[PDB]
Amino acid sequence: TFAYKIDGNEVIFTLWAPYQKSVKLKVLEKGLYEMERDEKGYFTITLNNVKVRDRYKYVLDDASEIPDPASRYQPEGVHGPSQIIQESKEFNNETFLKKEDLIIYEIHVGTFTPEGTFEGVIRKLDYLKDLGITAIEIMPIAQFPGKRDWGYDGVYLYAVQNSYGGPEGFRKLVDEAHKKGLGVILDVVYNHVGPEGNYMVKLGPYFSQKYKTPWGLTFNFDDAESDEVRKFILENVEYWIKEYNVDGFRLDAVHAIIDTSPKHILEEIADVVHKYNRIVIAESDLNDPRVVNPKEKVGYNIDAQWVDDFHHSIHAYLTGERQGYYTDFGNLDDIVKSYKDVFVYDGKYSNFRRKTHGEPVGELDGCNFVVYIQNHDQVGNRGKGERIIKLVDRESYKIAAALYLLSPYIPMIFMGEEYGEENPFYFFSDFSDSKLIQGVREGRKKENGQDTDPQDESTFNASKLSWKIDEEIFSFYKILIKMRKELSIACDRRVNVVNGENWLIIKGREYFSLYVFSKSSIEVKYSGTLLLSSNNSFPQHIEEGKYEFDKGFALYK
Amino acid sequence: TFAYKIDGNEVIFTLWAPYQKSVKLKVLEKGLYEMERDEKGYFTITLNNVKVRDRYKYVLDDASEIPDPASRYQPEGVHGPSQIIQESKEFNNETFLKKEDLIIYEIHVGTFTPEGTFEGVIRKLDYLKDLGITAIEIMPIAQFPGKRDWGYDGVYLYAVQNSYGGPEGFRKLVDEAHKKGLGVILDVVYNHVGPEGNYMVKLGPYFSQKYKTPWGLTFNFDDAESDEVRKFILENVEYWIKEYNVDGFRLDAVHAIIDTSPKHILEEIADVVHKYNRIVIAESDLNDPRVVNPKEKVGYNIDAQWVDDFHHSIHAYLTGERQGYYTDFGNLDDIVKSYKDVFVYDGKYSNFRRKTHGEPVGELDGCNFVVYIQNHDQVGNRGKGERIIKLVDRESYKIAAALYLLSPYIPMIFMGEEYGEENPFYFFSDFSDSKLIQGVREGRKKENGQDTDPQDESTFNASKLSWKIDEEIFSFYKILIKMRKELSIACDRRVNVVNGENWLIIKGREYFSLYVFSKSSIEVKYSGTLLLSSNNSFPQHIEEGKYEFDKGFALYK
């Protein structure tokens, strides 16, 4: 209840407008009307003449026409009139998506398929399925400005992307994957909004003034009317679930979500989701268990959370990288602790933030966290979106892959990565306000040295995937993904871990694994049969003793 | 460790100055020196020539002299040189102060005794003791600007007020009360700082930029170097405890204390205090149990918290008051719920904040909260600090008194109130920067209509207590305070409560009480003996039946 609501033959027009005195419905074809201002600040009207897949603008006091922020869909620009659509209405009391079986495929509909749409991505299902992926994670489809964006300027939480196809398409996309037995997971932004087409600002207070994130400012969940906005959001998740049988959510940078209330909005959301028996994952920098934490432990519940701590340890280890966050790591030791204690910052000094970061993760299964060697962020904000292939010796790139998919955690593959993709993932925008298409520039430029003027199709397309398979890499992947299942490696943190100066051997419940980054001697403490190696130098049937190995990765049993 | 530290014959000069490149110790008599800049940002020096009860200024890069923010004492202005003092060092592993026996006397050393000092307040001990008060709560003694302030512009957390006597005095004050068997409780401000003499600002980041309270902005407990500042504070409480055997703390507006860390600074402090087996109470607007909440329940622990909810219900009830917050109440019903469910806003709609305020207090004894009919705030910010005597029929004023002291809560009397004080408590400042002594004006003026130019001795002295006893009122009090003890009324929330249209009868463990605000018939359901009445119309030995009563209060058994 916020956008519109088709009854029988009749339709309503709710509209949170505290700041307004006079608001006017305006079917573009039909006419202009007067909303029933309720004391709380909710203008409102009721229609029946309408059925009309009609455009409409809300015209306020000031004498300005604007679009329904709960816009079901914005046919034209992020200034297009909002529009009537059908009531998908149907979805199911669940997700087939069981947590353990979780292989995530991060995708970016745009730069993905050369079509760059759902249709585009629909073509790859069976491919995806082939791969073994247990589910798909879509990057933000919240109507952003232009046609070229990661989707982090989504300024229409309710309206499904124009370009990407939209509604029916996105609609179709799920119904599709659904049949392919694939799960879909939408990654939604609740900690902020788009710098273009944002008309919250004139309807009332949607965003707190107390605080200031980096990208502008979060919404208002605390002060003055929190009540409403906090509902906005909360309804927003419900929508997805029913209007699109979505399988799960992925929350962007929760830690920019500020709440002081006795009940943190997160926990508020989690419940909405778990209510429909769906899943939630969140991007959180704060090495805090709270999030993913259980109800008994007064945690928000959130099903799972990303652990960049993993990534980083590995990355800076393989690369001789020490910039920005990389400075907190770049070492073997890190890799192991992360491997056994989810966070590398368990409550210790980050010189990076000159603070005392994170704190001990519980006794939570590996499945409360999701690991990766790649993601839009990690590639994306490099200045030249270098994939990781471009910075590591081939054997390495293979090793890494192993590391992560072989974790109890919840392995998620960036798009491309599996088949050995070398294209880059660039920072691209599609703004219109001069000051935007500018500020941005010195931004990405000053922030990350990106040269590729994001506001250039160039930068764009150059990130489009070059479906150039590499069966070496591609093969591997499938295998890994496969062994993982076989082995029952998931969630389980009952692991034994060793490493030497440059090696590392990890026992598990059903095996051992060998990581050697440099020819060296290993006192292999066990006998198993080679299950998979990165090389050929690997001994099908191993036994306990000293052995000299070559830079490579081998997997026993 | 932050100010200085006298060793044997030698003394250190720590000094958090991240932003500084070159810092200089400067004994005013002796000389100027160079601090040992540590990477973390801590300049530093070591002395022995010194013993000297010497003044000193830290002279930074910019070529400016300034005083030790951990100033033990600021002899001259809030620009005076800091100064050497002795190492009180001694205190005890405890407080005689048991929580139940808790009668708080809120005092304001300045406007109190005509002397307006500790010495002044020392003269009243035995008086106080006489009253029955179980302990004293001092308003902020943190070096503020000028000589006339509530003390809410304290800008020197470590330095004891000049005017109020200072150190040795405050020192003496406690050692005194200690002997009188009286407990002392300092009310310290950690959510903000004084608008004059604040030199944190140039030493580095002491205060977060993420947020903005009302009175400027809180410190930085979250970001960049939180680590340090969070220690500042935390050491600050330790000081009080050892350098002054203080008995407890009272925290100003905690809810302006913003922390996202896994461990809320509050909980951080609580521990410091409970570590020394001392007590903590906090001013919190957020109807959140979290604070006062226990460790098992993942609460901050804080021993007790103020419940304005109480006050208000009563006040607006007795007064026909409905301004500002008064709008959320002004009703009988409120009075009872507050009486049985600590908060009146247990998670419901405050039109006052157009939000959904508070939430259910546990099953916490009445002793987690502290009630009052008066306090500096409630009088102080009225525009004409009207005491409550000035707005209620005499019988009322007596009734109220009963209400609160007869609660399981932790009754605290404002100063004056007990003996029937009619003087007002005004908003007074003693600033020097023109813009201050001005902004303030339209402030207090625009905020509360205060006319009494706070920057006028007038406004000041006029708040000084007129020790004009009124033995009627005065007597009552003592009695109440006395019965309370007798009765064992404290902490216990096992109460039965009734009211009629204008009356109210409250059973307890050892009695009943009758509140009648308007001649009416009461179906008194019990037999007891008059223990104390506000009037004479009260029936020494009561029995169950209908009886007509007169506006008044009576107490049975």
UniProtKB/Swiss-Prot annotation, chains A, B:
Keyword field: Carbohydrate metabolism, Cytoplasm, Glycosidase, Hydrolase
Membrane-spanning intervals of the chain: none
Domain of life: Archaea
EC number in record: 3.2.1.141
UniProt GO MF annotations: 4-alpha-D-(1->4)-alpha-D-glucanotrehalose trehalohydrolase activity
GO CC annotation, single: cytoplasm
Family annotation (Pfam families): Alpha-amyl_C (PF09071), Alpha-amylase (PF00128)
Subcellular localization(s) per the UniProt record: Cytoplasm
Active site: D252 (nucleophile), E283 (proton donor)
UniProt pathway annotation: Glycan biosynthesis; trehalose biosynthesis
Annotated family: Belongs to the glycosyl hydrolase 13 family.
The protein's assembly and partners: Homodimer.
Protein name stated in the entry: Malto-oligosyltrehalose trehalohydrolase
Organism lineage: Archaea, Thermoproteota, Thermoprotei, Sulfolobales, Sulfolobaceae
Gene that this sequence comes from: treZ
